[PDB]
């Protein structure tokens, strides 16, 4: 993707992450725990769902028969009719192929984007109280228990309260 | 603390602008391939013509007696349908079929032609109704006795209604010139038809044709649409199959050609000869000649649309 | 110090690939709906045929006397136009209309047919020019006296010019066989027309038709295009409306069918029956049969293209 | 959008920003003042204008009449003509819909991009002399008057001149 | 340490959604303009009809004697081709050409008509094979002696094969009625043709036409396709050019119209009259009527696709 | 482009960079040297090549002749045929134009993206041992010879080994 997170500096996805599209994996002193982020997940699904709502719509144009399967119509007019239909088919096969190719590129890139947005959001929450690994992890120099980690996930982390210790 | 994304053990491959076979966490099909082998007609007044050919509903061979004034939203033609009993054919037949497929059905009305000095009950063993009969909406006009001269005659009809009248007549080609003189008297025979927007002349051509239903003769069915307040005039001296009633179109409908049963328990709007395409997908790979309200036919059997992020397993 | 972006109190909703009704700061319409109820013809030699039917300019009924050699870039047909005076009809009429709509006008030239032994001044009260007259570009050939035999005759014309010649002739169907014998003598009548690329035969069919302009007879107008250096030959023995002049196409033009006035003060290139579409937009929702240089017709009434960022009010 | 600025970590737009698309809102000791950035604004408008120049072009293909509004052409050829025209209409309605949808996505995303480009440019100008809030604002620890702020906007800010104080 | 990207001294300008003439490091053409002025036919059984017109292969004028049972994957029509020797023309000629272009060639078989009481060796100096001859696949049926009556006759043929039979017959229009009576006896002449799906009558029309190959007479060639197990019946009393053999389609092929030489050393699948389009590009600006497997024709002469990053020189 | 590297905060490309699409230009004490980065270059070319593989494909639909160059077919059916063909041509000319325009935008933007991905990757390798100029260059405060620079390019740079000196 264009944003070099997913399949980029983040080495892999989590097959154990069954409760969201994106999430946090923390370790501190109590061990490790993993939880999903709802807002990022819901943003990507809402955008993908919008794409789906567009393509499964009704085209309320009725087309009627212009040739005959039981009693073939005159040859010349039949050749014009077959030629026209084959030309339209050429057009719709191309449009379908291009549409899906383009939309798949955009879907992958949008999911990549949502990860980077989550990553950058957290880094500034932690501000100077941490420096990032380079693999999607934040080396936290102050170190806090599970409620504080819980505070990073739901954006209740106050960088100042830990400010002096972390630089130190 | 580490940021991450989900992944799966076995993903689905899709295509993009830059790469073929990229694995994503989830995808969905856009091209419909599953067909329902029935004509899903739930909610729609349906007429299955069966052995009645669509054009026969205007002229009325025996197999169409039940369809002389049908009313429908959906019309189904069958491969075993026949427009005729006495061998013969319509001129510009497909144009008339397309008109009747979208007609919503037909309403017949007597045109009021009366005759004197001729026989009017021409019949054949090819149009059997407990013996020799004829097209129920037509009259086979012949001379009173064998070889008597068929008098030059003129019959006119004014469409006093508010929608166009479908007028059908026939030209009889007897198997020989000798047979034509018996039925209508000797000499060349001519029928001219004119309206405010129509003019065409017809001369019968007796001769041998291969035997169909025992006959080497044929009847040519011709038609025109007569506008409101316009008049049609027939001038003829023999070999003329006269119309007894005019047809009026009821409304709107759609016609299909199918080889499968009717199902009043499924509902559909896209039909082909093999059944019904019921789908929310924007494309189909089932039948390029499907009609109704249809997904666009495409040549591809499958086009997978990604619905999840790239799949990066561990 | 803070970075920011602008916003507005009331934005405009648009659609994207992922969302419907996203508000952006500004947007602009891509589908044209505003029509100008005039034929904008500024700068274009325009011919408004009015009561002259386009095909009449070749044969010359009275209402077309002013249009026998018109020249134009834009041709306007009107609903009140008539191609005929004596009731009748052209065979393959729409093909000839499409040829004349793009002709740029016509240039007439005498074909040089001379006659002896017949009358050449056939006239009717249906083609009135201060009394009975006929099509100005044709000659109604009849026998010298009532019921005299019309002699078998041959008339040929060579196109000595460098562009194809439009040749038109007519077949007269008298109201009765008795009337046909008076005008041309008794018996079957036949007209054969052949060139290097054309061959067709014609026999008249007398008979009653409903009365149009007082007549139950009709005239059939037929036509062909004669290539440079090619010759057309007419072989006939009666019931033949002979051409007096050939037509030559001037250049290029376009033809429309309208019910609105001409405006030499607006300029346009996309016309429909209701007027002119003047627009820089790539699409239109006004008339799917508009012609000229037009925005593409689309079924949507509106497609808003975003011209500003997302609108995030406070 | 894909870049998570506009409608992202920047909470809202400025309805008082009537002189540009993007801008700076500063406060120091003299109060607050707001000015627009010309280069970012002009980049987005130039790109949006280019899109406009493409779609309002001339198609110099002339189409002529092939049926008849006053004297209907023969039914069969008329049905082929109506069927073909309705098929082309189906194609152009889809193309118009898809074109506008795609272009609107790209327009929104490009405007989002121009904001992020402006934001990242300024952060490195200020270098280590500041740390960012997380809402699109730069907490400046050295603090300078209106001419110095003017120096950030027109990129005449010398980070070194204030270097020692800001870290301190 | 500094990060950077490459650039070039002279880049290539391309277009994007937002800008025209952006310079990129590299680009490639998507629209093909280079034509090969030969018919690249390597690997394909090719038949160059030359002076034989495609329809002539069914009737057999002298210039087509070498093509009476051709077999091909690719059929090339030439501008100098002629379908006829005796002047005349096919009815619905283009439909038959489209059938034969994709036929893969034809296989002839005797239909088995025998005659008694007439002459069967009608010949002309227009179909020269070391003197007067005729169409090799037809027989010109005439009366035994001058002005003798041509007997009413019936000839039937059953298609006993498994694919449709192409049946061709002719109507002879002599230059005068006097000439028609000499060849076939006096009076009106009629030929009726009927099958299970076909019925049409024909009467000859003698008359002067301009002289082509010395003759003012013409022959009309008519055709039908006869289904397996179906029968065709001809009923005639003169002016009838009878078929001697039926044609059967070999398989599949494609037909082109070209004015350039055959090249068995280049291979192609997209042909136009000026040669062959050999290209991997998705679009072409060479000929909108090219046929085969072709790049899509577009109106643009060039569409440059970027294959490198933006070019920012120093 | 959307990522504001190429033709953005990076002022120009290197006409001397003949061995790759992207690269490093270093100076330390031994002078200057320039080398190309293979991975970033190969990523962009692979994506551009994929685009090329898609557009130069076979369409195996055969179309046959429906009119006649030597003996013109009947006028009306010929006008319908010309009208239909001109309509299809209108459609394919638009599709070709739009396809190339869209793909060129995406190609330029993807190349821009690969640069930003390279830039951001290196900055976190150097972590706090450096601060960035603002022009695509990293001011390295520890300073190392050519083998160490070689270690940045092939990602064998250990920030800790130089950690104390660089902050100092
Ligand atoms: C040949 O037998 C019949 C038939 O049943 O078709 C007998 C019919 O009564 C007769 N009807 C009339 C009105 O003449 C019919 C007729 O002779 C032929 O069909 C004429 O071609 O023949
Ligand atoms: C019936 O009256 C007229 C007419 O005015 O149409 C009288 C015309 O002089 C006469 N002209 C000729 C050349 O015969 C015309 C004619 O008899 C009919 O139109 C023939 O159908 O009739
Ligand atoms: C006019 O000369 C010929 C010719 O060579 O065409 C002589 C032919 O033998 C003759 N053939 C027959 C079968 O009659 C032919 C014929 O008279 C005309 O072609 C009839 O139009 O004429
Ligand atoms: C039109 O298409 C069908 C196949 O879809 C074909 O069988 C038929 O022959 C075609 N019509 C003509 C006149 O060839
Ligand atoms: C994958 O996508 C399809 C269509 O969007 C959906 O019906 C299905 O439930 C999805 N599966 C999972 C596991 O999300
Ligand atoms: C037909 O004529 C009647 C008068 O008899 C009139 O009421 C009616 O409106 C006319 N209809 C049309 C379609 O002209
Ligand atoms: C909004 O866009 C349209 C079309 O681009 C333009 O004419 C109009 O002036 C714009 N309005 C403002 C307030 O920018
Ligand atoms: C027609 O013949 C003349 C000779 O009389 C000649 O000059 C002219 O070029 C010919 N035109 C065509 C189109 O063959
Ligand atoms: C073609 O379309 C118009 C409506 O746009 C319709 O009224 C007309 O009847 C159609 N032609 C035929 C022959 O049905
Ligand atoms: C530029 O692109 C074309 C097509 O991709 C390629 O054939 C050519 O070798 C390229 N040139 C360079 C210098 O990369
Ligand atoms: C034709 O009839 C024969 C019997 O003589 C039979 O074997 C064959 O299957 C039939 N063919 C068709 C197409 O009906
Ligand atoms: C169809 O197009 C060609 C030009 O491509 C033109 O010369 C020809 O006249 C057209 N057909 C008709 C019947 O006009």
Automatic annotation (TrEMBL), chains B, C, E:
PTM remark: Palmitoylated. In natural infection, inactive HA is matured into HA1 and HA2 outside the cell by one or more trypsin-like, arginine-specific endoprotease secreted by the bronchial epithelial cells. One identified protease that may be involved in this process is secreted in lungs by club cells.
Keywords on record: Calcium, Clathrin- and caveolin-independent endocytosis of virus by host, Clathrin-mediated endocytosis of virus by host, Disulfide bond, Fusion of virus membrane with host endosomal membrane, Fusion of virus membrane with host membrane, Glycoprotein, Hemagglutinin, Host cell membrane, Host membrane, Host-virus interaction, Lipoprotein, Membrane, Metal-binding, Palmitate, Signal, Transmembrane, Transmembrane helix, Viral attachment to host cell, Viral envelope protein, Viral penetration into host cytoplasm, Virion, Virus endocytosis by host, Virus entry into host cell
Record-annotated disulphide pairs: 40-266, 52-64, 85-127, 270-294
Primary subcellular site in the record, as a coarse category: host cell
Portion of the full-length sequence here: 21 to 334 of 560
Protein name: Hemagglutinin
Species of provenance: Influenza A virus
Keyword check for Calcium: yes
Gene Ontology molecular function: host cell surface receptor binding; metal ion binding
Subcellular location: Host apical cell membrane; Virion membrane
Record family assignment: Belongs to the influenza viruses hemagglutinin family.
Function summary: Binds to sialic acid-containing receptors on the cell surface, bringing about the attachment of the virus particle to the cell. This attachment induces virion internalization either through clathrin-dependent endocytosis or through clathrin- and caveolin-independent pathway. Plays a major role in the determination of host range restriction and virulence. Class I viral fusion protein. Responsible for penetration of the virus into the cell cytoplasm by mediating the fusion of the membrane of the endocytosed virus particle with the endosomal membrane. Binds to sialic acid-containing receptors on the cell surface, bringing about the attachment of the virus particle to the cell. This attachment induces virion internalization of about two third of the virus particles through clathrin-dependent endocytosis and about one third through a clathrin- and caveolin-independent pathway. Plays a major role in the determination of host range restriction and virulence. Class I viral fusion protein.
